[PDB]
């Protein structure tokens, strides 16, 4: 024993226990999801209202990379911000050299290789976040989810944090019941419902819903936050489905 005390050490299993411990920080965080739709992607997150003293709509969690990529994460919030800052530098150097905005699969590997590098040495700690991200590029819509190990795949729907099992079940129903696909406006409504349903795992404190989206038709392939009437319409739809 002692194999779990230092990052980058293989245990006799062939496991890196420090990475598995980082996953526990992710499992402890609030719920966040992603839904791939017909011509884009939708992101949503659970924000716990710790106190009445929190200013509504101000502590924004979802982050934009370049102008076409959205990023959301569960776990240690500062570690997520560090990863997005790097993502922004990677997207900038890609656009500087190659002119075109970074494709989503290209961007996914840039984050993936950087997270993976923080499992190679004992002088650094792994990332304590799982990050759901994506957007629209020349080849269409793409949704990804990236783990503390550096592992990532493409997704039809993605979920992480404390309510992930609840969310994953709901996402699996949408995939079965909509093989031809889901619209962007539908995906916003469904994203609200899934966060509300996933809130049963964090049910002590009340919460605030936050949604964003990239869609070729609805946002010209740019990342935007869902605000005002369209946000309230999604909240009302979510409130109706739980009752």
């Amino acid at each position: 024993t002692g194999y779990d005390l230092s990052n980058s050490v293989f245990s006799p299993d062939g496991r890196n226990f420090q990475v598995e411990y980082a996953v526990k920080a992710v499992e402890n965080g609030t719920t966040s999801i992603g839904i791939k739709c017909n011509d884009g992607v939708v992101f949503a997150v659970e924000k716990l209202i710790t106190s009445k003293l929190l200013v509504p709509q101000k502590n924004v969690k979802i982050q934009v990379v370049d102008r076409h990529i959205g990023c959301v994460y569960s776990g240690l919030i500062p570690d997520g911000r560090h990863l997005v800052n790097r993502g922004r530098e990677e997207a900038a150097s890609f656009k500087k050299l190659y002119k075109t905005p970074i494709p989503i699969p290209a961007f996914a590997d840039r984050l993936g290789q950087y997270v993976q590098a923080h499992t190679l040495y004992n002088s650094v700690r792994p990332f304590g976040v799982s990050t759901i991200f994506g957007g629209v590029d020349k080849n269409g819509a793409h949704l990804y989810m990236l783990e503390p190990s550096g592992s990532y795949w493409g997704y039809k729907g993605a979920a992480t944090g404390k309510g992930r099992q609840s969310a994953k079940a709901e996402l699996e129903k949408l995939v079965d019941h909509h093989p031809e696909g889901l619209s962007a406006r539908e995906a916003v409504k469904q994203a609200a419902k899934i966060i509300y349903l996933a809130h049963e795992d964090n049910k002590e404190k009340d919460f605030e819903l936050e949604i964003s989206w990239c869609s070729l038709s609805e946002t010209n392939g740019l990342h935007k936050f869902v605000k005002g009437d369209l946000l309230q319409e999604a909240i009302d739809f979510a409130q109706k489905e739980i009752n």
Binding site: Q63, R88, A92, F225
Partner: protein, 233 residues
Amino acid sequence: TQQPIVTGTSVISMKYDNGVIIAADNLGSYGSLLRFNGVERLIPVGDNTVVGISGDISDMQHIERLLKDLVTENAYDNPLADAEEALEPSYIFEYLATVMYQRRSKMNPLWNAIIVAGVQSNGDQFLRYVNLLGVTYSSPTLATGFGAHMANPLLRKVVDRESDIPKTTVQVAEEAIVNAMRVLYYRDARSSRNFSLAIIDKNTGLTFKKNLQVENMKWDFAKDIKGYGTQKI
């Protein structure tokens, strides 16, 4: 240290009662060769600012990318990026002025003269110049290159001091700019007939006009000019 290769000539501008106007022709010269005839030298930043650039075109394209990247960066973690925390003309200018002076101080300048025209949050007109040396100044009219020598005299007849700005309408100001562009086409050997013009108004916003031409030209008196003194036919 370098030398400019592909170049753009005059950028001209002025304040009027409710905003600012700026203009520049669509040419990229290669010395005396009038090489590129479709070059846009007015570059808008948001809906409140237009940066007009003369001098080296390779350095202009670099600056264009810096400004494009500045908008991207301002949007990051900024819920008020299209409202109270949007980029202002004054912010865009100071950034460019910092870069210009830093580059001259490393003996590797961006070989340009730049005019930032826009309208601020409070409705105030913004118009300020910066060049390859980092020299900056503001005035009710501003112009680069040949425009300094020929356009400013004409534009100063409309707005000679600060107190003339409220008295000047957008029609009068645009007329003065269009005439100045004609005078430059008569007299600047590295100019073109085709140009772009931009109006930034506090009420009506950003109006960007492409593919304008110098018109109502006087050449008829040329038929009566013969020889260089004694020749009668």
